[PDB]
């Protein structure tokens, strides 16, 4: 619904291109942090990560014109599918994204019963991450547990 113009937006892109202060077309904690430290001079070492992960609507690798474009324009996050396992889903979403890279696991899986050290939680999700794109997307969470 509604096709965003590439003309005006592109202008926003012109900034998003300089905003990268490199000419890569992707904003990551690397470049973003540089400015966030010399300009923003505040954002914690982990914040820019939470800031980047917060913009990772598509979470493909880093900040991109489209993902950053939406997050800047709107801020909606509906959901119409999670019928079952929706409880464990919120229980495992900890942060509040949908994927369990490790954070959620760490706290939830350590409080759930055992104590998955930073080693287990890291590797477990590394080997558990069926797709192995970099994180654990519910799509696999269910396809592995729910789906045969």
């Amino acid at each position: 619904a509604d096709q965003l113009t590439e003309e005006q937006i592109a202008e926003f892109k012109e900034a998003f291109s300089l905003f990268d202060k490199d000419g890569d077309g992707t904003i990551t904690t690397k470049e973003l942090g540089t400015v966030m430290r010399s300009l923003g001079q505040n954002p914690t070492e982990a914040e820019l990560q939470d800031m980047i992960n917060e913009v990772d609507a598509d979470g493909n690798g880093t900040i991109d014109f489209p993902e950053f474009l939406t997050m800047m324009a709107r801020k909606m996050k509906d959901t119409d599918s999670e019928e079952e396992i929706r409880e464990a889903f919120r229980v495992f979403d900890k942060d509040g994204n949908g994927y369990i890279s490790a954070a959620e696991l760490r706290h939830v899986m350590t409080n759930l019963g055992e104590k998955l050290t930073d080693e287990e939680v890291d590797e477990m999700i590394r080997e558990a991450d069926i797709d192995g794109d970099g994180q654990v997307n519910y799509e696999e969470f269910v396809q592995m547990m729910t789906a045969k």
Binding site: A88, V91, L112
Partner: peptide, 20 residues
């Protein structure tokens, strides 16, 4: 063996059995 599979899957299962 690999650690994880049927580990944290069972975790959730743990809850359900005794949600509280």
């Amino acid at each position: 063996l690999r650690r994880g599979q049927i580990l944290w899957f069972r975790g959730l299962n743990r809850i359900q059995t005794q949600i509280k």
